Amino acid sequence: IKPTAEQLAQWEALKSVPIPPRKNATLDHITNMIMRHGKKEKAQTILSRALYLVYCQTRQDPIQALEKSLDELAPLMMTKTVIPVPLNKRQRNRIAWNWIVQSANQRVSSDFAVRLGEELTAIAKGTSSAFEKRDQIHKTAIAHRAYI
Amino acid sequence: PYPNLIPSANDKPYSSQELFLRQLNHSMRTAKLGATISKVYYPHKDIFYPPLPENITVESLMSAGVHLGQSTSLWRSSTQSYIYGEYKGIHIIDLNQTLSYLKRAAKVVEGVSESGGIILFLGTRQGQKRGLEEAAKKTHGYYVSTRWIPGTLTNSTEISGIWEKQEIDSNDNPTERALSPNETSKQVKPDLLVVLNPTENRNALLEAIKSRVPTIAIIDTDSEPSLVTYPIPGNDDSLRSVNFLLGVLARAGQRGLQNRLARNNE
Amino acid sequence: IHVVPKLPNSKALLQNGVPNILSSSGFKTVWFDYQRYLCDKLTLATAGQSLESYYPFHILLKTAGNPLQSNIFNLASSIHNNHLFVENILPSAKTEPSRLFLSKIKDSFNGSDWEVVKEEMIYRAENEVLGQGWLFLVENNEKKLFILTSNNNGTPYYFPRNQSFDLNSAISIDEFATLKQMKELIGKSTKLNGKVQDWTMPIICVNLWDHAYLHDYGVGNRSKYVKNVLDNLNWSVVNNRIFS
Amino acid sequence: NILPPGVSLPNDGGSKSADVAAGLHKQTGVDPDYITRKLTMKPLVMKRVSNQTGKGKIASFYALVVVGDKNGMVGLGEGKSREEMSKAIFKAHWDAVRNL
Amino acid sequence: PVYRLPPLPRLKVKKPIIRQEANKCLVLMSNLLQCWSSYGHMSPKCAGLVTELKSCTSESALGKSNINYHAARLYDRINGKPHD
Ligand SMILES: [Mg+2]
Numbered sequence: 001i002k003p004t005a006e007q008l009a010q011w012e013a014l015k016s017v018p019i020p021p022r023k024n025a026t027l028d029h030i031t032n033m034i035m036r037h038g039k040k041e042k043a044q045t046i047l048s049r050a051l052y053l054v055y056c057q058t059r060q061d062p063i064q065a066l067e068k069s070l071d072e073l074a075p076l077m078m079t080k081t082v083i084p085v086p087l088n089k090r091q092r093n094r095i096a097w098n099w100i101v102q103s104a105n106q107r108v109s110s111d112f113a114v115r116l117g118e119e120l121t122a123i124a125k126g127t128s129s130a131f132e133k134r135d136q137i138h139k140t141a142i143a144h145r146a147y148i
Numbered sequence: 149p150y151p152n153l154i155p156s157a158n159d160k161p162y163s164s165q166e167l168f169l170r171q172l173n174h175s176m177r178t179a180k181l182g183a184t185i186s187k188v189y190y191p192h193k194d195i196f197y198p199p200l201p202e203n204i205t206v207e208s209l210m211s212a213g214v215h216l217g218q219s220t221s222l223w224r225s226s227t228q229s230y231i232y233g234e235y236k237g238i239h240i241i242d243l244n245q246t247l248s249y250l251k252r253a254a255k256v257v258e259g260v261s262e263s264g265g266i267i268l269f270l271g272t273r274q275g276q277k278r279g280l281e282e283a284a285k286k287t288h289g290y291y292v293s294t295r296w297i298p299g300t301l302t303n304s305t306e307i308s309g310i311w312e313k314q315e316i317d318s319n320d321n322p323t324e325r326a327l328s329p330n331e332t333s334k335q336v337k338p339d340l341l342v343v344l345n346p347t348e349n350r351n352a353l354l355e356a357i358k359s360r361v362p363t364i365a366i367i368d369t370d371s372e373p374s375l376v377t378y379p380i381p382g383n384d385d386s387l388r389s390v391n392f393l394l395g396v397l398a399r400a401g402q403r404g405l406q407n408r409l410a411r412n413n414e
Numbered sequence: 415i416h417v418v419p420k421l422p423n424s425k426a427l428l429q430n431g432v433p434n435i436l437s438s439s440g441f442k443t444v445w446f447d448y449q450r451y452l453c454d455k456l457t458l459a460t461a462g463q464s465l466e467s468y469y470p471f472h473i474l475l476k477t478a479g480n481p482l483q484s485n486i487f488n489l490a491s492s493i494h495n496n497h498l499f500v501e502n503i504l505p506s507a508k509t510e511p512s513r514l515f516l517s518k519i520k521d522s523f524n525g526s527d528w529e530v531v532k533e534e535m536i537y538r539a540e541n542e543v544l545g546q547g548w549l550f551l552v553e554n555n556e557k558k559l560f561i562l563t564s565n566n567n568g569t570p571y572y573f574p575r576n577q578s579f580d581l582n583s584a585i586s587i588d589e590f591a592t593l594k595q596m597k598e599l600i601g602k603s604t605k606l607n608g609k610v611q612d613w614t615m616p617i618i619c620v621n622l623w624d625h626a627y628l629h630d631y632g633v634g635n636r637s638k639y640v641k642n643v644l645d646n647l648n649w650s651v652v653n654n655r656i657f658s
Numbered sequence: 659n660i661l662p663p664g665v666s667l668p669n670d671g672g673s674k675s676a677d678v679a680a681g682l683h684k685q686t687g688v689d690p691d692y693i694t695r696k697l698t699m700k701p702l703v704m705k706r707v708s709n710q711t712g713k714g715k716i717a718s719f720y721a722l723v724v725v726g727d728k729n730g731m732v733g734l735g736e737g738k739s740r741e742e743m744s745k746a747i748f749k750a751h752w753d754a755v756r757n758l
Numbered sequence: 759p760v761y762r763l764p765p766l767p768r769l770k771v772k773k774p775i776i777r778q779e780a781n782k783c784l785v786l787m788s789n790l791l792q793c794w795s796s797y798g799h800m801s802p803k804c805a806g807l808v809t810e811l812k813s814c815t816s817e818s819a820l821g822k823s824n825i826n827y828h829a830a831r832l833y834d835r836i837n838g839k840p841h842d
Contacts, residue, residue, distance in 0.1 A: 158521075162557060170613070173657050174615055179471045181470075181494060182493035182497045183417060183453050185415070185416060185469065
């Protein structure tokens, strides 16, 4: 087969582009962490609703705010049995999300989506107690650096 | 000459294959212009243009490095009579004795080939396959260069019995006659075994001794002369010397074969 | 040991030399004396080295890219070129130019016929080659012929060593541009040796060295010698050198 | 009949001396007739030798025989067999023929 | 002086020691910990190093001796035993 004009033009135009991503890895991982009993859609609804409150109270991109929050809160390394060990992206995200979920559960709304969204809004404005947990973990790592 | 080649059009430049053929035509005609090279050693010739046994001099054997023996620290004292002396920490082989033994072994090979016997060229060092194969092909013989299976002679039924055999005329022409299973399963034993590295082929030498197969070998300073029927004192670790001696023996075998064919064609 | 190649009809060439170009004494100078001289010098230069095992053409192809053995290259080049020259003037192995060569000259030289091309080559040799040199008619990879001249001992095969420009005197700005593009072509190659591919081959070779003509034609009148060489070539060899 | 392409049943195909001669001619080129007719064998030593092993004791039969044509050729052969003494004698005869 | 061993059943190293290269992530972590030890945690000075770690461990947290073989292969040649 000899490709015609339109086919070759399409091939060139497309090969000049990268492939779109199937899913946002971080958001999918957070959703799966919210998931229980295989109810993916419930977790997606909860996460999207919380992010929607985050936007409505901050008026900035809430996906970016969530990643700023997870990146800043999550500890880079953690002491384990006592030696420090580094943490990759997923472990850091899991620890940060657990810290987020505790403070969210401490709130008053009967709906978990509202609690989570308001907690993420507070975090995006630099107001959270999980910073203290991160500081304590980092301090312990500094104290036990000698045993690397 | 060069089928399935599509020439190019005159308007367009040469193709890669057209350039290759053009340069080949240049090479076969004009690349060799300006001088003729003389008195220069070319390794391949040692395999393809070996000298006759009577034309060998001590100078030619020394040029091939046949005289260079093993280190004086690895001396096998049973090889005392073949040694001319020691020089630069190694023993020097007496090349007149080498010439005599080599002429005798070449006569043995020529006689065996002229009688229609089976000649086996065994050499298992790294780069010896080419010379072994060429010697076997020009002597209508056989060769081994990968590995000598122990029991190849004393246990021939369990090793070499499965491979096919062939009836041939006085002129080495296939007859294509059907062989009976008993004939196919008999031992076919070499009439002459020549070993290039007898130190690493003790199994073959012992099997030849047990099976009464006369054997030739290159006996270095550290090798046992009495383990072989027709020793050849010389260097066995240099490929040039080994190929020189092997080419001499192979040319003797080829001369014997040619004499046999000439007599059968008269 | 590089040895002077044996030539067909050597006894006749000793008796008279190449007819209508050289006398016997001149042919002795150009070939029997100069080729022996060059071969002996090459043997002295390359003995005890790898290059004793290679022919002069393979020597010069090997040695073209290394500055410090240019002398060897020079000898090799001459030892090749001289023989090429001799072969196009040998009496025989009258021979006629082939149809293919005439077609290529007609196509290569913008429709010009062979004889005016001969006169143009005479002009080129008179003009650019001041003193010792070589003249060639060469074909490139495009199946196009053209006229090349080398000063002293130069080779047609490798264009870095063509030695077609005499820098002892001035150079035209176009020649400088040609030199600069040539050096860029050399430098572009990724090979450590710096080698480049050149498929040029000599169809015709003429010896402008003083050994060829000085005894038979004097200090001047070299163009007379070139004309005599070109008129009475051995066309069998020239036709064979071309590929079809 | 349904015979395979080659049968090998000498009685149904549709002793020590003979087998020794055949195998020796097959393996070394010795003449069978000379072995069967001219050579004579007498067993010299016949014994049972045992080997201990973790599972149990293993018994084998050792035979040493001498063969000769009574005209200047003599050979000694030793044979081992875990199964039977007759096979040991067969192997000893084989070896003795090989050691003539 | 030269010492010559007897004809030995074997030539083998009991415990060949291999040069495993310390993981880049571990040393970067150590450097970060020393940075926060001296300048202080979340100090402006060495914060750049943190970025490197954030990349270096992003995909994964952490990101052979043939002496016995060659010795066994070559022993018969180099042992220098007497002939036989
Ligand atoms: Mg040796």
